[PDB]
Symmetry: C2
Subunit: 220 residues, 2 copies
């Protein structure tokens, strides 16, 4: 127990999407070993945000993932020292976001330092017209590369007028300390905005994440 | 009924990979409602194949998917008229495969006509050096686009060595008749070569495939 049953979170995000600068801070709590967490996010500059808040939410810590015992837990092993991750979000209309987060801990509180850059979103697309409703749930594919951990996930925004808008995430997760490396595996996610105000200047955000091998057995 | 509890398969693939021409035929059988199947495949022209057989396996029919009653089964509903699909396989060293399959039915037998083109495999890469061991199991994400069904999946080739070579599959599945369209969902896979002669001129190939929604409940 360096990672406790219950851990708090603090976070600072600096961002810019299609020219628009903003700053968001968050406070929250979760249960690393259950893989659940809840954050309260507050826009401190750049309100009201002229884009879909959904592009931001996965930026706001795989320490909150239920890991089974037969899969080494890359993320919980790197604490107290921590880790950082970097991600590219590639949208099917050629927008991209590049994100970096640096994760630390002190006592029972994680702290994140986040940079968020989005660009080339079409001005009449679903992101810039706030036409998204949520992220679908997902299955991220986890795999070791050059001594560290990668995660790739096919994501999808549910639009009103129930089509989808696809986005591919690739993330490199880098432990500060060397750790027992896991075999290829999956992390199932469901990310959800539970409540927001009109502007999305205040958001309550929840994630459930559960790591696993395939449900399907191997044939002899 | 139409799709029986047991359906036989016959197929014919015409292929080219890095300039090398080949033809493969196969016979076998499966259980469309269990999502299981076995194929016995034979290289008719182009032996010995100079590249990894693994790049071909996913080309060798989502009617072999166990669908739960609460998710419309797009693939079983298109029979007996059939369907076709078109796929890009995009490898991380920028090799690329483009694949087409036309799927038909006679009585208790599916027949496929497959066109496989692969190119830009680097000559010391693991595909042309036959350093691949298998695909990992995967989770394909299914969503409707303009009245048909797309499936995207992050795939990975386990390497003789211990690392992985990533490949992204994008597939359009086009039913030949109007059919009840499913909501966003997931198909889990595990494709496996069970046995092969030494040149892979004979190969016994197995797939297990089960459709579902997220394992994780929503939060209200």
């Amino acid at each position: 127990s360096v990672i406790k049953q219950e851990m708090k979170i603090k976070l600072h995000m600096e961002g810019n999407v299609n020219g628009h600068a903003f700053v968001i801070e968050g406070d929250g709590k979760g249960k690393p070993y259950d893989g659940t967490q809840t954050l309260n996010l507050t826009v401190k500059e750049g309100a009201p945000l002229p884009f879909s808040y959904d592009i931001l939410t996965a930026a706001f810590n795989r320490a909150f993932t239920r890991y089974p015992a037969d899969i080494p837990d890359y993320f919980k092993q790197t604490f107290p020292e921590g880790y950082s991750w970097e991600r590219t979000m590639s949208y099917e209309d050629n927008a991209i976001c590049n994100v970096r987060s640096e994760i630390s801990m002190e006592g029972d509180c994680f702290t994140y330092k986040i940079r968020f850059d989005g660009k080339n979103f079409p001005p009449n697309g679903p992101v810039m017209q706030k036409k998204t409703l949520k992220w679908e749930p997902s299955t991220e594919k986890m795999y070791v590369r050059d001594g560290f951990l990668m995660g790739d996930v096919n994501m999808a925004l549910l639009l009103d007028g129930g089509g989808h808008h696809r986005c591919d995430f690739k993330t490199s997760y880098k432990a500060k300390k060397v750790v027992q490396l896991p075999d290829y595996h999956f992390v199932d996610h469901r990310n959800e905005i539970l409540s927001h105000d009109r502007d999305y200047s205040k958001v309550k955000l929840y994630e459930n994440a559960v790591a696993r091998y395939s449900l399907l057995p191997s044939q002899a």
